[PDB]
Amino acid sequence: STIEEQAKTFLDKFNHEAEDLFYQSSLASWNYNTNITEENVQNMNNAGDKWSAFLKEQSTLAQMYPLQEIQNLTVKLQLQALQQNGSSVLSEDKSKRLNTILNTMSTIYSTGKVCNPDNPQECLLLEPGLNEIMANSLDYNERLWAWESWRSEVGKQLRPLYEEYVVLKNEMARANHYEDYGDYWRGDYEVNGVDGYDYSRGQLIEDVEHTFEEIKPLYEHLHAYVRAKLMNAYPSYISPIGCLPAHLLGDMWGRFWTNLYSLTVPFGQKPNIDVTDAMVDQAWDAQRIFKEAEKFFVSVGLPNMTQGFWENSMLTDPGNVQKAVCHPTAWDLGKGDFRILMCTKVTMDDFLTAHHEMGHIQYDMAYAAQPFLLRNGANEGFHEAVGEIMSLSAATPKHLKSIGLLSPDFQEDNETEINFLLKQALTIVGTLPFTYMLEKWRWMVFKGEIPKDQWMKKWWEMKREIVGVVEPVPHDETYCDPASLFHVSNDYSFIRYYTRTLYQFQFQEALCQAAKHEGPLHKCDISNSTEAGQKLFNMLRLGKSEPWTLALENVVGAKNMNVRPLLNYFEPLFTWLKDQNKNSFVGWSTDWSPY
Amino acid sequence: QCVNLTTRTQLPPAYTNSFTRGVYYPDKVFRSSVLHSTQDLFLPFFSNVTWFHVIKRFDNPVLPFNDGVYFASIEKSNIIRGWIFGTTLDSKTQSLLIVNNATNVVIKVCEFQFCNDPFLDMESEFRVYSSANNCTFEYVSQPFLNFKNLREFVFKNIDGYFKIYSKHTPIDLPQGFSALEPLVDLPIGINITRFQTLLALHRSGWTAGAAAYYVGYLQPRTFLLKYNENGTITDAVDCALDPLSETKCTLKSFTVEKGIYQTSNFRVQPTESIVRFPNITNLCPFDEVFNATRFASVYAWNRKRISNCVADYSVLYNLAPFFTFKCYGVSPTKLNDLCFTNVYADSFVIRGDEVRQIAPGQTGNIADYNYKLPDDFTGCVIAWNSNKLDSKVSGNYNYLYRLFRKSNLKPFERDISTEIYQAGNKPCNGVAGFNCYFPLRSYSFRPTYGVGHQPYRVVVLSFELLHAPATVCGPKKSTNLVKNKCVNFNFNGLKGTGVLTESNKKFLPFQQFGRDIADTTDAVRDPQTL
Amino acid sequence: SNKLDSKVSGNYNYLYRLFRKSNLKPFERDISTEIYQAGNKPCNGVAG
């Protein structure tokens, strides 16, 4: 008879009726992604229209009772997520424009093609062709030409587009009783009503700054070595005191430094830990590649796969006639259906990605007992981090020897650990200054701290100070460099990767300490450890029911962000950086001395 | 520790005459100058008794125990030591052990790992078993002890009591009579079917002296015991040896005067035990319960009452696809012979993960809101995969379940209400608004799910007994009628003993069994074949 | 002995044998824990 019992009777019915439609929305999306055809497109559109309207039709019917009188933490959390206005708080005309603004950025980016002037007979798209020349070509001007030409054309066609994007996004957040749209993303980590585990949305920015103050010393030595290595590749175009040119990061945005292994190889003579030749020699098909993983995932304690997964999931390219989406994605179809969409190759990377996507799936049925609306990670960082940690163990040479990929007679010399650690530093340590700067920049443009005519100048000066990368030429306000990224132009959260990076090492150390490992973190593995899985399984089963601070404390013992696992992982490499950085200068200067 | 012995000599078992040995004082009472008749387990007179000899002869085999054992040992220097008892002679089951060392007598009842060749070794060694985990009974007493030593023992296992008798006599078996006296009773309470013997080896690599022991088997029979004026048994008569001794056992005397006497009657005892019941007809219709084209939803579970028929639960138990056969409160084996007044077939279809909720004392969506099972539930539940039938690629929405109710459903209560559930302050008024949804959700199955979520057709059998005559019985097996032989017949509850032969009698069609002038059942009609 | 032999969560210290191939003799004790067989298929140490 109490209002709280009303909330108790409102969620389970909403959860199951969503499950019937969420699967159909997911299955039609899966049916579209397994074989693209015109009917599969409209079934997704019909399901997507039905799924989007079903949430909206209950959104109108979920926001007329106060939430201060409901005591059940899971129930209160479920209603707060459903009450979130989203795009429903604006008027119909504004919502019709905001979605089109979102749509017009996607179609411009998807069809974004840059080709050489005086050669219009055929042009080249960004994802298929421009990405190939982005890391394999060793020409300064040709790579600079593509870097300048893309942002010049794309920036002109997105700068007016992003101006309407930021004002409309900021208006919705203020209409949602939020200070800025950056706080709307910060609202995913919001925890309320729990003592000891309470978290503030505005605390995340200083927590990121607090975490980053120790990332910088590790990054500066990594930056100096890369600059010293790229000094050999480019003798005079990089100053020893200035920042790196913006078009020499291995990618257009500089997000990933993994492309610089050949450029920045410490010991090229020694062979790598790759055992791909053994995979093809022994004919390790994708069926047994995942079956080898299944042996590993049950060794730590996680459950095995079901009959539904193997039958319906495609682990190989279907063929020419059957066109399918090849992007590796784990599908939580709901109602106990979990499928992995991967056009898997017989390679080391796909073997590592197989663990990553199954770990995403292995995360899904852990909270299968949770309510459907709570059938998500406590924050956007756990879902990706739990998949990243298991690829860390899969790359250990000890695992490869155990499953026979690596010969038992191979010697893990110090250099191959240094070389492997550098590659992981490129993908993790290198991206953090870029991961922080974009989110920090976006947090202010939604706040309005940066002047509206000073967006790009503010963008460049911090990139020199944060990432240590200098622009080739000054860019005026007529262009929009930041919007060229996939995440920003499609309204995608970017702080997830920053939290995933910290959770990945925090979880790795916690698993390694649980597994009673006698060596460093990089050599550590979670195989043949029973207690590691159960400690891991505690947060996986909770899902979003318990605060992410509580889930973190159940694993690492600390509710807040911790960076100590990250530096411990790269400590053998960090000391190696210090030894060879005596000649080079650690750090950079904000001046444009290089270019 | 076990030591394997390979100096044995292979020889078939010898035999010899028991004569009149193996008579023990049947009770504790003194009697003098009285010819008393007793009926117990005894060793038959002049029977075959197995002969064992050790010298290079080494005899220590495994012998059956049966109802009893008479053990003798014409011995010198006392090589023989003790005995072993049990059913498997290892720590899978409880076992007994008896030893007689040079100092005392040791009896242990513990769960030994007996060696392949237990033995002993003056005495300065011991090799009988390797381990003994759970020991129950222990005891200690005084040592029991041209061949000169003759020992005789009797072992019985009745009502958990191990009766032991003994007698020593200074001297093939001798031609003489001497009764055995009770020695020790042990309340072991174990099962015994085989027994061994214990030997002490002499080393001078081991040399065995000349020793011989005999093993008999006791049988249930009547003896006639004569007590002298000093209370000592001096003579006996086996009441079932030969017709002459049967006359003495009937006249209660040892000398029979000239004449003709009537002792006992001739009995061609039976052989089989033929039970017959009518043909297996009027079967309970369980086919449409499990082979049904459609199954009802879990919230609206179909209830089927079964009566006035014979219930063949063996058919359901014999189908492999019925993977989960969980029965609570009643043994699955005795479902046939047990009789119930009414059986309620409760059919429904649920997901894979909610199967555990179909059990007494369980909770969940199904247990509390769809189907509740009482704690004192008598019956079985059967679950089988139904992905090939209850799943559609587009989705099988035909199944619905109940999720919300003001309280947990009562046992065996079905709820099909469709009114919009009311929870708190503001009335719903039948409007699917905020905090007001339909009280029913729909199971929507697809053939793309795993073992944990596939639709399972689960039917629960509710067993009850009422004041009304329980007309649901199991099948009654009928052995092939035996003819021309004494058998223990049981026809439609008519019990008796005798030889069943053919009949020339012309029974009338309604007549079942015929009687003689003595008013006793002499003719009977088989229900299987009239 | 409801005070001393009842646990709120449930006392499982007491066990009773449900299945056996035959009835015991009077005052006879059985402590065998081997898996009972009900069908023609031999157990082979499997509780299936």
Ligand SMILES: *[C@@H]1O[C@H](CO)[C@@H](O)[C@H](O)[C@H]1NC(C)=O
């Ligand atoms: C190809 O796409 C169609 C679109 O409806 C789909 O029905 C079909 O199953 C797909 N082919 C395969 C082999 O799955």
Ligand SMILES: *[C@@H]1O[C@H](CO)[C@@H](O)[C@H](O)[C@H]1NC(C)=O
């Ligand atoms: C509140 O209800 C949820 C069910 O949605 C339950 O999991 C939780 O334990 C309840 N909390 C309290 C304090 O009753």
Ligand SMILES: *[C@@H]1O[C@H](CO)[C@@H](O)[C@H](O)[C@H]1NC(C)=O
């Ligand atoms: C969503 O928008 C409606 C309409 O303005 C408003 O009443 C409701 O409070 C909003 N939701 C939240 C959680 O504030």
Ligand SMILES: *[C@@H]1O[C@H](CO)[C@@H](O)[C@H](O)[C@H]1NC(C)=O
């Ligand atoms: C997963 O494990 C369970 C029990 O350990 C087993 O019954 C099942 O067959 C396994 N699944 C596969 C695909 O092997």
Ligand SMILES: *[C@@H]1O[C@H](CO)[C@@H](O)[C@H](O)[C@H]1NC(C)=O
């Ligand atoms: C690795 O460690 C060994 C051990 O002394 C040392 O000799 C070698 O120089 C080290 N190499 C690097 C690259 O640190």
Ligand SMILES: *[C@@H]1O[C@H](CO)[C@@H](O)[C@H](O)[C@H]1NC(C)=O
């Ligand atoms: C871990 O367990 C698997 C399962 O038997 C085994 O094959 C493997 O050798 C074990 N790992 C090690 C390092 O022994």
Ligand SMILES: *[C@@H]1O[C@H](CO)[C@@H](O)[C@H](O)[C@H]1NC(C)=O
């Ligand atoms: C002993 O057994 C043999 C063969 O079984 C038989 O011929 C003989 O008559 C038996 N002896 C006695 C005394 O019954």
Ligand SMILES: *[C@@H]1O[C@H](CO)[C@@H](O)[C@H](O)[C@H]1NC(C)=O
């Ligand atoms: C009974 O005992 C007395 C004296 O001990 C003895 O004279 C007599 O012979 C005994 N009777 C028998 C039948 O041996």
